Amino acid sequence: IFIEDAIKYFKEKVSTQNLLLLLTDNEAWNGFVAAAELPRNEADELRKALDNLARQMIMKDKNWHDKGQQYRNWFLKEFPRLKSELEDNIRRLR
Amino acid sequence: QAVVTQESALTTSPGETVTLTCRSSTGAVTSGNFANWVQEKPDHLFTGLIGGADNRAPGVPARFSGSLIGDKAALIITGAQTEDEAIYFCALWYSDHWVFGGGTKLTVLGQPKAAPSVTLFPPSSEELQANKATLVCLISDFYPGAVTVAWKADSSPVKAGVETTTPSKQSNNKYAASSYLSLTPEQWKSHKSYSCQVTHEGSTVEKTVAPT
Amino acid sequence: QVQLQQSGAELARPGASVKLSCKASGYTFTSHWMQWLKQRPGQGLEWIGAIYPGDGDTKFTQKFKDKATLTADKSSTTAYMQLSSLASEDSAVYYCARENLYGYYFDYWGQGTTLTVSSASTKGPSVFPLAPSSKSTSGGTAALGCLVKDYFPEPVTVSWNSGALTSGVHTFPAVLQSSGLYSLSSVVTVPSSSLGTQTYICNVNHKPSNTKVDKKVEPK
Ligand SMILES: [Cl-]
């Protein structure tokens, strides 16, 4: 019921961007589940459902597809991290 | 409020490559605008050609391709066929809505002159029994798409009661028109014949009917 | 095969409202955005809005937000567009088309609904047989037809022999007369020998006046 109720909320207030931010960062999920005082077992069932909701939103909204701008914006904001992580990887091997 | 701009018109010949373009008023056309092309053929036959700048729809010939060149979105027809004579619309996506351009009329040169077929019908007895009379002159399969129609009562010109259509491009790229002469039953049975004379590029085709 | 079948009132009064419908079949209705477009006479396509039958979400150009209302029926898989506050600029042919979810092209289209917004009276057509006269019947083939006289507003649909006769059919665009009334003719070219033995029937429909007539065209 509660989880079912929560999903109907993430569709009202939360934007797809904000939902992904919540799903992608583990610091963010904790601040969410702990602040909500959720049980751990129910927490995973919920994290599973939002992933599901996040996936249904992406299919629906071409803006989040490869050619979609929200995707390329997400990809632009993530780029500085991927670059440095790949740079560090190479130094080791090389 | 966003404005999408296409060439108003382009000409090509069979075999040649031709490029149509799409421009956005807000800036360069990017992948996020999902440049969309649809073809409009006669009798409002719309066909989706391209989605997302370069996705070619199933059933669309290979000679159509799509690309972001510029600045703009482009539709390329690599070896145009006479059957590609059509209007081409380009639409751009702006976050939460599509905007269509004004479309480009593509002409393919080299089509041969075709003289009109002319069919003329007298008033029906049913119409006559209702105290009316209409002569019907159907004009089809002519190219280029301009004709002049003249009506004759016996040998004298008739101007009153003539209603004639604008020519209309058929599916096979030639034109059709029709012309109607309204008369009284009295006027109809008082002449020996009426005629529909259609002139097309200096040549005339004539049909005649009589009260019988 | 994916099909889009449209329906709706073809005449409305100014200031009034009308609801058009688009029945979808042949795919997963909930999975694709249903587009709505219009084409006014002598102009290009204009996009109105879209709906996602999965959750009823919609998109609009600002211009149509407080005018067009988009809804969808998941069970009958039909999308609806209600237009409000009708005006002259709303006379046009309205199309529904599918936006392929991952293609992004508009692949399948409805046949369009013709809508006239006017305060004028509907008038139904008289239908007259266009029978070829003797001098016009001496050839191998001959043209016979139907005159669809003095109606308002557009459209009229004509078919022959309830659609079983299609070869040789040519329905001509209407003339708009100075009376403000339309007329159009439909003809079919047939073997001359068949006139007077074979029955040819033109099926005329003018929905705004509920005129639906199947006229037998006799030999003259
Ligand atoms: Cl004909």
Numbering used by the authors:
A (entry chain A): 66 to 159
B (entry chain D): 1 to 212
C (entry chain B): 1 to 220
Authors' description from the paper:
The difference between the two chains can be attributed to crystal packing, with the C-terminus of chain A being exposed to solvent, whereas the C-terminus of chain C is engaged in additional contacts with a symmetry-related Fab. Chain C also includes residues K142–V168, not seen in the Fab6D12 complex structure. The main difference between the two structures is that the long helix 4 of the Fab6D12 structure is bent in the Fab3B6 structure and that this new “elbow” harbors the Fab3B6-binding epitope (I123–R137) (yellow in Fig. 2a). The paratope surface is predominantly acidic, due to four acidic residues L2-D54, H2-D55, H2-D57, and H3-E99, which all engage in interactions with the four basic epitope residues.
Apolipoprotein L1 (ApoL1) is a circulating innate immunity protein protecting against trypanosome infection. However, two ApoL1 coding variants are associated with a highly increased risk of chronic kidney disease. Here we present X-ray and NMR structures of the N-terminal domain (NTD) of ApoL1 and of its closest relative ApoL2.
